[PDB]
Amino acid sequence: EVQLVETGGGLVQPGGSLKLSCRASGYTFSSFAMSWVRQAPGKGLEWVSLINDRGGLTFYVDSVKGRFTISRDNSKNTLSLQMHSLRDGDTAVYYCATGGMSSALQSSKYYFDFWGQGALVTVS
Amino acid sequence: LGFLGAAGSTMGAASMTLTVQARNLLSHWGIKQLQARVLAVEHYLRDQQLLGIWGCSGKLICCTNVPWNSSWSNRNLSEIWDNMTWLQWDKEISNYTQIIYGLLEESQNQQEKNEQDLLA
Amino acid sequence: LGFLGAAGSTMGAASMTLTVQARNLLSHWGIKQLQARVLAVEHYLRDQQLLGIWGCSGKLICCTNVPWNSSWSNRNLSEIWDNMTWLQWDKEISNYTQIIYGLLEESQNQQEKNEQDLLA
Amino acid sequence: LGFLGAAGSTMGAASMTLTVQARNLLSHWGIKQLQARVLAVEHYLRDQQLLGIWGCSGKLICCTNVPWNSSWSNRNLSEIWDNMTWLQWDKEISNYTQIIYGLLEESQNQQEKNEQDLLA
Amino acid sequence: NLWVTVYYGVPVWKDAETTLFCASDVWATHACVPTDPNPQEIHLENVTEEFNMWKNNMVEQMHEDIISLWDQSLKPCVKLTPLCVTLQCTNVTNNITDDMRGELKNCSFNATTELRNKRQKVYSLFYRLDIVPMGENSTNYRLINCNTSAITQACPKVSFEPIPIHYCAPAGFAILKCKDKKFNGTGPCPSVSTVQCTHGIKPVVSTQLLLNGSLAEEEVIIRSENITNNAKNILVQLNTPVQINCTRPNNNTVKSIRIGPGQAFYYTGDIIGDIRQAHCNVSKATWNETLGKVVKQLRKHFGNNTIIRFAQSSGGDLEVTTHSFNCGGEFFYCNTSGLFNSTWISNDSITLPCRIKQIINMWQRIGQAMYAPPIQGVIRCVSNITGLILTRDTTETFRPGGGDMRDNWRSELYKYKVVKIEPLGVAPTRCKR
Ligand SMILES: *[C@@H]1O[C@H](CO)[C@@H](O[C@@H]2O[C@H](CO)[C@@H](O[C@@H]3O[C@H](CO)[C@@H](O)[C@H](O[C@H]4O[C@H](CO)[C@@H](O)[C@H](O)[C@@H]4O)[C@@H]3O)[C@H](O)[C@H]2NC(C)=O)[C@H](O)[C@H]1NC(C)=O
Ligand SMILES: *[C@@H]1O[C@H](CO)[C@@H](O[C@@H]2O[C@H](CO)[C@@H](O)[C@H](O)[C@H]2NC(C)=O)[C@H](O)[C@H]1NC(C)=O
Ligand SMILES: *[C@@H]1O[C@H](CO)[C@@H](O[C@@H]2O[C@H](CO)[C@@H](O)[C@H](O)[C@H]2NC(C)=O)[C@H](O)[C@H]1NC(C)=O
Ligand SMILES: *[C@@H]1O[C@H](CO)[C@@H](O[C@@H]2O[C@H](CO)[C@@H](O)[C@H](O)[C@H]2NC(C)=O)[C@H](O)[C@H]1NC(C)=O
Ligand SMILES: *[C@@H]1O[C@H](CO)[C@@H](O[C@@H]2O[C@H](CO)[C@@H](O)[C@H](O)[C@H]2NC(C)=O)[C@H](O)[C@H]1NC(C)=O
Ligand SMILES: *[C@@H]1O[C@H](CO[C@@H]2O[C@@H](C)[C@@H](O)[C@@H](O)[C@@H]2O)[C@@H](O)[C@H](O)[C@H]1NC(C)=O
Ligand SMILES: *[C@@H]1O[C@H](CO[C@@H]2O[C@@H](C)[C@@H](O)[C@@H](O)[C@@H]2O)[C@@H](O)[C@H](O)[C@H]1NC(C)=O
Ligand SMILES: *[C@@H]1O[C@H](CO[C@@H]2O[C@@H](C)[C@@H](O)[C@@H](O)[C@@H]2O)[C@@H](O)[C@H](O)[C@H]1NC(C)=O
Ligand SMILES: *[C@@H]1O[C@H](CO[C@@H]2O[C@@H](C)[C@@H](O)[C@@H](O)[C@@H]2O)[C@@H](O)[C@H](O)[C@H]1NC(C)=O
Ligand SMILES: *[C@@H]1O[C@H](CO[C@@H]2O[C@@H](C)[C@@H](O)[C@@H](O)[C@@H]2O)[C@@H](O)[C@H](O)[C@H]1NC(C)=O
Ligand SMILES: *[C@@H]1O[C@H](CO[C@@H]2O[C@@H](C)[C@@H](O)[C@@H](O)[C@@H]2O)[C@@H](O)[C@H](O)[C@H]1NC(C)=O
Ligand SMILES: *[C@@H]1O[C@H](CO)[C@@H](O)[C@H](O)[C@H]1NC(C)=O
Ligand SMILES: *[C@@H]1O[C@H](CO)[C@@H](O)[C@H](O)[C@H]1NC(C)=O
Ligand SMILES: *[C@@H]1O[C@H](CO)[C@@H](O)[C@H](O)[C@H]1NC(C)=O
Ligand SMILES: *[C@@H]1O[C@H](CO)[C@@H](O)[C@H](O)[C@H]1NC(C)=O
Ligand SMILES: *[C@@H]1O[C@H](CO)[C@@H](O)[C@H](O)[C@H]1NC(C)=O
Ligand SMILES: *[C@@H]1O[C@H](CO)[C@@H](O)[C@H](O)[C@H]1NC(C)=O
Ligand SMILES: *[C@@H]1O[C@H](CO)[C@@H](O)[C@H](O)[C@H]1NC(C)=O
Ligand SMILES: *[C@@H]1O[C@H](CO)[C@@H](O)[C@H](O)[C@H]1NC(C)=O
Ligand SMILES: *[C@@H]1O[C@H](CO)[C@@H](O)[C@H](O)[C@H]1NC(C)=O
Ligand SMILES: *[C@@H]1O[C@H](CO)[C@@H](O)[C@H](O)[C@H]1NC(C)=O
Ligand SMILES: *[C@@H]1O[C@H](CO)[C@@H](O)[C@H](O)[C@H]1NC(C)=O
Ligand SMILES: *[C@@H]1O[C@H](CO)[C@@H](O)[C@H](O)[C@H]1NC(C)=O
Ligand SMILES: *[C@@H]1O[C@H](CO)[C@@H](O)[C@H](O)[C@H]1NC(C)=O
Ligand SMILES: *[C@@H]1O[C@H](CO)[C@@H](O)[C@H](O)[C@H]1NC(C)=O
Ligand SMILES: *[C@@H]1O[C@H](CO)[C@@H](O)[C@H](O)[C@H]1NC(C)=O
Ligand SMILES: *[C@@H]1O[C@H](CO)[C@@H](O)[C@H](O)[C@H]1NC(C)=O
Ligand SMILES: *[C@@H]1O[C@H](CO)[C@@H](O)[C@H](O)[C@H]1NC(C)=O
Ligand SMILES: *[C@@H]1O[C@H](CO)[C@@H](O)[C@H](O)[C@H]1NC(C)=O
Ligand SMILES: *[C@@H]1O[C@H](CO)[C@@H](O)[C@H](O)[C@H]1NC(C)=O
Ligand SMILES: *[C@@H]1O[C@H](CO)[C@@H](O)[C@H](O)[C@H]1NC(C)=O
């Protein structure tokens, strides 16, 4: 069984910062690209950020491009996201997801295979 | 981790040791040794010339614009790049190598002319 | 279609066989043959070094930033690429060759220092 | 302005004569002279191979992604490029060289994999 | 869909024939590079490779290099052409045992000197094998090689010591080593590693018993191109040495003369004390245990409920029917019928009589002959028997063989193969320009 578990933050003030992290198990962590997908309580899903399986290549939705940092630790099976300047518009559930990219010697993806439970991030 | 250490490993692993092998390609009684050195150099230069012709000069990994006709090998990316060793792969596409080299040469010539007619 | 087959053709045709000729540049009794092989290698390397100095490494057709002084050859394009063979062209710019090579070297050095000063 | 003419000048000046030196690297009785020619060629090729490995093929000045650990030399820019000559610089950082070369190789391997994974 | 991606530095190789060079620490050239010590041996964890001794070109190069270097060492040495005269030979005036009767002769002759017009009377002691009678009952004899090519005297300053030579690959090539302890010379080898250069191999030249080679790691290994073809030789590698002690127990006084302008000739002047036959000792128990092991392994190729018989070589000249070797610079020809005389069905020692020759041909050639200067004093050498060369005729009969020197070298080079590295190749990926 594949699990992705968010162990993130809670309620913060606008303009500050909040860090999320996700622990993973049940698969080789290092074999998959990962991403964060956001869902405001009354909205659909939005892609936020993508990181390659070796941690070298990152991509962002333009709305967070100058504010968010996505990272990876393959020794600790951990995915993380550091958000800055916390806009009120960033209140949402942040899901840890596996998929969204491959490495040119692998079959392609372009879809998400696994999801975590989602951290709820609230900005006042 | 040393020269040819990855020879028994899968292609998807072996491809990360390309610099290890590249650095081990260079360096009457006594005449046969000079003859061997000269030939080793000519061999080296021919490999470099092909990379030049195909537009892969200066790099160990080079992507191209030539597609993979499945008639050469219909194996999927999983089997090639996570089971087979490079030795086994080479023995499969041994017959269909000259074809590939010819296609790579033609593609680069088309690319050079188009680029020139765009900087005009 | 073979080596030097285009030698009697016009420059605009001959430029399409550059790979044909490039591939034919590489491959006490026996000493003079060994000397010949060594010298052939040195000749080859000097031409490659020179292309590198001018910023043309790795390509058969290299556009540059040096302009053509009409005093070298005042012929138009339809008199150089449609009415002349490379053999006849070579014996027309023969005594302006070193001038051109010197300019190409200077142009590349200026470009390299300017690119570095832009990466800051 | 000739070969090694800039040897006594400062690094910031000497760097403008890189082609002066690059062009002077290439060109039983007689065997020793053949050995010298062959070795000069192998030496040349090893340096060219190394520039290729680091991703500096084809150029005299190459900027990289490896940062300068200050433990190798904590001198500032006005002390390195305005006063020191390349001979004195070489002596100063000679034993931290094979660390720098290793870092340059590792950086390029990572750079190649990222560009292939992006051209997908 | 998929695109061709070019890779350079790919760990792939193909069988190839190239020139190898020597690395060492006179059997030098002073052109062998220093060994470059402590060679590295990358293990190649999952590489299985096909080996085929007997088709291995490394053998041919070792053979040609040894012969060439041998001949080169004689280029500056004295040519013994002034000695092709009618030697007057009589019986030696000493205490000669029965085993040595007729083995030595005291020969007088007229030699040239430093001056064209001056002659000297020289006498020396020759072994019977080096001379041939021209007169029927007369005491007139001539040197063995004055009707064929001229004999070259080996230079007294040059030893014949088998100094190890390592064989190193040129750039672009690699040597693969088979580490399978039970490898029989051919076929797949499940454990293969990459050596930069081979171990040092001592160029020991001998016939039927291989001396000072490598021992098998665990058990006796019998290797042959075709074990059922009686035209092939069988190379038997032992897992234990048999120690052999050889001697020439005669105190030799060496004298010299000038024969020309800076040209000296060396010869046996006299013998101090009694005259005895040269011989070699092989421990009896050790030798019998060694054969028992060989027989047990032969039974795996031949019928199991069989009879294995050992016998002496049936014929040919001294160079092929005896155990020929260099002991302290002298050339010995020992009779091994005392070692191979038994039948095996489903503190004693063995003494082998030895003959000595000063005029030898070394290689199986017609146009060359060398004179080995006699050596002052008494010679004793001790060496290890590390393998045997046998040929095959119910009951299987085996006899000593080994006339072809390439077999000595095969016993050391069998674990090595030379391959060419081919770093360029292609494979499909999802990457495109
Ligand atoms: C198998 O291996 C063994 C072990 O290496 C080998 O035996 C060795 O042979 C050499 C050469 O005969 C012996 O070296 C001599 O030792 C005596 C000691 O008193 C020295 O006096 C000798 O020097 C004189 O002779 C030299 C010519 O050989 C001259 O060059 C020198 O100037 C002197 O005049 C010489 O050093 C060595 O002692 C033995 N080793 C042992 C343990 O006995 C054997 O020969 C090899 N077998 C085969 C077939 O190759
Ligand atoms: C070999 O023959 C020579 C003679 O050609 C012997 O030398 C002579 O020996 C006698 C004693 O019996 C001396 O008086 C002479 O002066 C010796 N002559 C010379 C020229 O030295 C020699 O002893 C014989 N050797 C053997 C082993 O038989
Ligand atoms: C060495 O030379 C001497 C002098 O020529 C030889 O002595 C003569 O030999 C011939 C036969 O060859 C005889 O007919 C003479 O009577 C001998 N004369 C003397 C002075 O004795 C001597 O025989 C030669 N030695 C050899 C090897 O034959
Ligand atoms: C090889 O074996 C022989 C025996 O066949 C040894 O010869 C004996 O040596 C001792 C030395 O103290 C003498 O007292 C004996 O009289 C000799 N025996 C005979 C029958 O003569 C010889 O020493 C051995 N060693 C070798 C070849 O190194
Ligand atoms: C080794 O010595 C043996 C003697 O022990 C020699 O064998 C004899 O050879 C003659 C001639 O062919 C035969 O008539 C005898 O019957 C053989 N004797 C035995 C006991 O078989 C043998 O020839 C010698 N071998 C070498 C290579 O010198
Ligand atoms: C793909 O290959 C098809 C079969 O033709 C040939 O035989 C195979 C085994 C290869 O050797 C190939 O190179 C030969 O051309 C062609 O009919 C088909 O046109 C080819 N398609 C492409 C993409 O060129
Ligand atoms: C890849 O294909 C595997 C089965 O391979 C089949 O036979 C080989 C020789 C090729 O012809 C290949 O195209 C065939 O499909 C599957 O077991 C494996 O799951 C596949 N992996 C994927 C989907 O990439
Ligand atoms: C072109 O060059 C002229 C200088 O070159 C002169 O003529 C050439 C053919 C050579 O013979 C050379 O040695 C001579 O010095 C300059 O007058 C002229 O300004 C240049 N024109 C341009 C466009 O730069
Ligand atoms: C190029 O010039 C062609 C020929 O013109 C004449 O001959 C040359 C050698 C000079 O002497 C020139 O002054 C003469 O007028 C023309 O026929 C051709 O059309 C021209 N082409 C173009 C496109 O300019
Ligand atoms: C910078 O260097 C520090 C000390 O480096 C140590 O000494 C040098 C001469 C080398 O032998 C090096 O391998 C040793 O670690 C390091 O502790 C430090 O991590 C380095 N920092 C960076 C930027 O990597
Ligand atoms: C550069 O440095 C000059 C003196 O250098 C001092 O010692 C060397 C070894 C370094 O540790 C350097 O950082 C030290 O400052 C100064 O005189 C000069 O003002 C400095 N210039 C600049 C541009 O900082
Ligand atoms: C050899 O195969 C084993 C699996 O049997 C694998 O774990 C090991 O990594 C392989 N060795 C190399 C160098 O790839
Ligand atoms: C290895 O081969 C098997 C069978 O074709 C295939 O299922 C697998 O995907 C291949 N490689 C891997 C481990 O991806
Ligand atoms: C390649 O050609 C050889 C000789 O015709 C043939 O035996 C082999 O089966 C061919 N291999 C492939 C992959 O077609
Ligand atoms: C030679 O000139 C004729 C025109 O007269 C042309 O058709 C032919 O292709 C030319 N041959 C070459 C090699 O250019
Ligand atoms: C050269 O080519 C041009 C353009 O085709 C043409 O007008 C001119 O007459 C030609 N001159 C010759 C025949 O040399
Ligand atoms: C230079 O070359 C041109 C064309 O070949 C020729 O007309 C001229 O006479 C040459 N000048 C000299 C100095 O040879
Ligand atoms: C040598 O040093 C002097 C200052 O003493 C300086 O002016 C001169 O330019 C230097 N020479 C070179 C070649 O840099
Ligand atoms: C060092 O550089 C400074 C600034 O260019 C200059 O004034 C000084 O003369 C230089 N000293 C030496 C030793 O070159
Ligand atoms: C290494 O170089 C530094 C700076 O030149 C020097 O202080 C140190 O003594 C050197 N160490 C060795 C190995 O000589
Ligand atoms: C020579 O042999 C005889 C027996 O034939 C013996 O009496 C004599 O003592 C021996 N000579 C020497 C020096 O021992
Ligand atoms: C000389 O030796 C031979 C053996 O070669 C022997 O037959 C002859 O009888 C011996 N003659 C004398 C006088 O000792
Ligand atoms: C030399 O003579 C012997 C007879 O004593 C003969 O057997 C041998 O074949 C001859 N050698 C040559 C080269 O004629
Ligand atoms: C050596 O082993 C191979 C294993 O494939 C076998 O075919 C060959 O016959 C064996 N050699 C001998 C002499 O038995
Ligand atoms: C081995 O020798 C026998 C002799 O009868 C022959 O029939 C057989 O074909 C040979 N085998 C090989 C592999 O050479
Ligand atoms: C050989 O000599 C050694 C002493 O160096 C001795 O121990 C051994 O027993 C001898 N071997 C034989 C067969 O006599
Ligand atoms: C050799 O060993 C066998 C088997 O143990 C034995 O029957 C035979 O008598 C032994 N021979 C000798 C000379 O020790
Ligand atoms: C051969 O004999 C040995 C020893 O008795 C036995 O272990 C082996 O199984 C036998 N092999 C055959 C094929 O009979
Ligand atoms: C073999 O041994 C027997 C004794 O069993 C002996 O009579 C015979 O002469 C010996 N043969 C050889 C060649 O030594
Ligand atoms: C040979 O005899 C001489 C007599 O002076 C003696 O000095 C020498 O040591 C003896 N050599 C041997 C090996 O016994
Ligand atoms: C014989 O083998 C033993 C193995 O322990 C070795 O120590 C000894 O030196 C070898 N003898 C010779 C002469 O090489």
Domain boundaries, chain A: 3-123
- List all residues 6 or more positions away from B112 whose beta carbon is below 8 Å from its beta carbon: C59, C60, C61
Alpha carbons B40 and D46: distance in angstroms, whole number: 13
Spatial distance between the Cα atoms of A102 and A31, rounded to a whole number of angstroms: 9
CB-CB contact of E391 with E433 (8 Å): no
Contact C27 B38 (CB under 8 A): no
> Chain A residues within 8 A (CB-CB) of chain B?
105-107
Mutation target to probe the B interface, by most B beta carbons within 10 A, among C38, C59, C61 is C59
- Mark yes or no for CB contact A108/E429 under 8 Å: no
Q: By three-state DSSP, how is residue E131 classified? A: strand
> What residues in B contact C60, CB-CB < 8 Å?
53, 109, 112
- The pair of structure tokens assigned to A124 is 């006042």
Which helix (H) or strand (E) covers residue E22, if one does?
Answer: strand E21-24
Residue E38, CA distances (Å) to C93, D31, E147, E149, E162 in order: 59, 30, 51, 46, 21
The burial class, CB within 10 Å (0-12 / 13-18 / 19+), for E293 is: middle
Tell me how far the alpha carbon of residue C76 lies from the centroid of ligand 16, in angstroms: 10
Amino acid occupying residue A95: Y
* Residue B57 in contact with partner chain E when CB distance is under 8 A: no
What residues contact residue E1 under an 8 Å CB cut-off, 6+ apart?
B67, B68
3-state secondary structure of B112: helix
CA–CA separation, D114 and A99 (whole Å): 18
Residue D65: burial class (beta carbons within 10 Å; 0-12, 13-18, 19+): exposed
The pair phi, psi for residue E22, each rounded to 5°, is -100, 140
Write down the CATH superfamily of domain A3-123: Immunoglobulins (2.60.40.10)
Count of alpha carbons within 13 angstroms of residue B109, beta-carbon side: 13
Phi-psi region of E269 (alpha: psi -120 to 50; beta: other; left: phi over 0): alpha
Residues of B whose CB is below 8 A from D57:
57-59
**Residue C95 burial (C-beta neighbours within 10 Å; 0-12, 13-18, 19+):** exposed
The single residue listed with the structure tokens 């000497």 is D14
| D114 residue type, one letter | N
Beta-carbon contacts of residue D114 (< 8 Å; ≥ 6 apart): A52, A56, A57
User: CA-to-CA distance for E104 and B47, rounded, in angstroms?
Assistant: 67
CB-based contact E359:E352 (threshold 8 Å): no
Beta-carbon separation of C58 and B57 below 8 A: yes
Q: Is B96 in the pocket of ligand 6 (CB under 6 A)?
A: yes
Closest-CA residue of D relative to A109 is D120
Tell me how crowded residue E132 is: count the other CB atoms within 10 A of its CB.
13
Spatial contact of C14 and C90, defined as CB atoms under 8 Å apart: no
Cβ distance E70 to E201 under 8 Å?
A: no
> Residue C45 forms beta bridges with which residues?
none
Query: Is E13:E424 a contact under the CB 8 Å cutoff?
Result: no
Inter-chain CB proximity A56 and D114 less than 8 Å: yes
Amino acid code (one letter) for A94: Y
Which chain E residue lies closest to D120 (C-alpha atoms)?
E431
Could you tell me the sign of the dihedral formed by the alpha carbons of D76, D77, D82, D84, in that order? Answer: positive
Query: Which CA distances in Å does D65 have to A57, D54, E233?
Result: 15, 10, 63
Contact E428, E4 (CB under 8 A): yes
SS3 A71: strand
Q: Do D46 and B26 touch (CB under 8 A)?
A: yes
How far apart (Å, rounded) are the C-alpha atoms in residues D13 and C118? 19
User: Angle of helix D31-53 relative to helix B31-54, nearest 10 degrees?
Assistant: 30
Can you tell me the distance from the alpha carbon of B100 to that of E277, in angstroms, rounded to the nearest whole number?
Answer: 74
- At position A108, the amino acid (one-letter code) is S
Which of D80, D105, D102 is CA-nearest to residue D90?
A: D80
Specify the long-range contacts of residues D102-106, CB closer than 8 Å, at least 24 apart: D103/D66, D104/D53, D104/D54, D104/D64, D104/D66, D105/B19, D105/D53, D105/D54
Instruction: Please tell me the distance from the alpha carbon of residue E28 to that of residue E35, in angstroms, as a whole number.
Output: 12
3-state secondary structure (DSSP) of residue E320: helix
What is the C-alpha radius of gyration for chain E, rounded to an integer number of angstroms?
26
Binding partners of C (≥3 Cβ pairs within 8 A): B, D
CA A98 to chain centre: 9
Instruction: Give the C-alpha separation, A6 to A9, whole Å.
Output: 9
Can you tell me which residue has the tokens 């030898």? E360
Nearest ligand to residue D99 Cα? 10
